[PDB]
Amino acid sequence: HAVSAYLADARRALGSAGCSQLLAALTAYKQDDDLDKVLAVLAALTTAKPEDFPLLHRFSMFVRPHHKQRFSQTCTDLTG
Known part of the structure; x- marks a missing residue:
């Protein structure tokens, strides 16, 4: 779920x-x-708000495998 x-x-x-x-x-x-x-x-x-940052990280479930790392990398780049 x-x-x-x-x-x-x-x-x-x-x-x-x-x-x-x-x-x-x-x-x-x-x-x-x-x-x-x-x-x-x-x-x-x-x-926009730091408290919403987890949502970004949790979006990984929808990403196809070949895009995973880039996405993961990009996540850190947007969070710091």
């Missing part, structure tokens, strides 16, 4: 509009495989 836990936490922190935008970005990524675009949406939504 990790997907539902993520969706619940993300909705609670970001609101309906933010959750919907992140979900649309997620479907776009599932379709076209463009890592940087969805990372842009996710970083804009989650890095």
Whole structure:
């Protein structure tokens, strides 16, 4: 039940509009495989407040294997 836990936490922190935008970005990524675009949406939504930083890190579940490390690296680059 990790997907539902993520969706619940993300909705609670970001609101309906933010959750919907992140979900649309997620479907776009599932379709076209463009890592940087969805990372842009996710970083804009989650890095504004430090308390939301975990959401970013937890997005790793949706990433395909060949994009894992870059994403992990990029996560640290956005968090410090």
